[PDB]
Amino acid sequence: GDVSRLNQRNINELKIFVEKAKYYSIKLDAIYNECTGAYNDIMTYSEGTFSDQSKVNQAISIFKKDNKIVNKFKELEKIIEEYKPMFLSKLIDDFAIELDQAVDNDVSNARHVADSYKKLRKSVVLAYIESFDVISSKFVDSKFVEASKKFVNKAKEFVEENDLIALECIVKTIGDMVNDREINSRSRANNFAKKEADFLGAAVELEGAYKAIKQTL
């Protein structure tokens, strides 16, 4: 029986999300580039020797100064909040609290800032996938829903290997599908090529289901 009207409403919701979230990977890269030195310094020099306390203090400053990094995470949260309300809220608060307490010089405290940052950045990537999951799950097309669950699973496995690389690939690939650009199914990576290709395989299946919907419209 014809469910064209429902399928067009589902496509509309997906296209809105993807276009609104299209800078998600660029914005997470900007956090990565500003914080990586500081994160690595905290991990290296947090061994209780105070030998490099000044380096740890400067690394904490990168994460804390002008609330800038916290606000970058809040900007990414504002994109997903419509779709996964309170997904990131707790982890953003836990980071904010650790940053406050890091004024107390301590090796543990700084390590907790670094750990809290790493956990929150991974959750920001997962929140993109969790938002796609919720949108996909409103589709009335069973073949699209089945392909979506597989895309979500392979997306989360890719994240386990590397959060930012997975997010970059997920954002470009779903972008290509909703803008009717043929998905490239091949990884040319020297790191994570197996997991990338597995995810691209699930994306090609989803593109097939999506195109089958579009040809009924």
Numbering used by the authors: 19 to 235
What sentences appear in the manuscript?
Lyme borreliae produce other outer surface proteins, including CspZ (also known as BbCRASP-228,29). CspZ promotes bacterial dissemination to distal tissues by evading the complement system, the first-line innate immune defense in vertebrates in the blood, through binding and recruiting a host complement inhibitor, factor H (FH). Additionally, CspZ is only produced after Lyme borreliae invade vertebrate hosts and, as such, induces CspZ-specific immune responses after natural infection. Similar to CspZ, CspZ-YA is an all-α-helical protein composed of nine α-helices (denoted as helices A to I).
Here, we solve the crystal structure of a mutated Bb vaccine antigen, CspZ-YA that lacks the ability to bind to host complement factor H (FH). However, in CspZ-YA, the distance fluctuates between 2.6 and 31.8 Å but mostly greater than 4 Å. Such a distance is unfavorable for the formation of the salt bridge, suggesting the destabilization of CspZ-YA. Additionally, the three-dimensional structure of CspZ revealed a hydrophobic core between helices G, H and I where residues Y207 and Y211 are on one side, along with F176, I183 and F217 on the other side. Unlike CspZ, a cavity was found in CspZ-YA due to the replacement of two bulky and non-polar amino acid residues, Y207 and Y211, with alanine (the red highlight in Fig. 6D). Further, the altered conformation in CspZ-YA prevents R206 from interacting with E186, exacerbating the cavity-mediated structural instability. In Lyme borreliae CspZ proteins, the mutagenesis of Y207A and Y211A reduced the hydrophobic interactions and created a cavity at the C-terminal H/I loop and helix H of CspZ-YA, destabilizing the protein’s conformation. However, the RMSF values of R5 varied among these tested proteins with CspZ-YA having the highest flexibility (0.9–5.5 Å), followed by CspZ-YAC187S (0.9–5.0 Å), CspZ-YAI183Y (0.9–4.7 Å), and CspZ (0.9–2.2 Å).
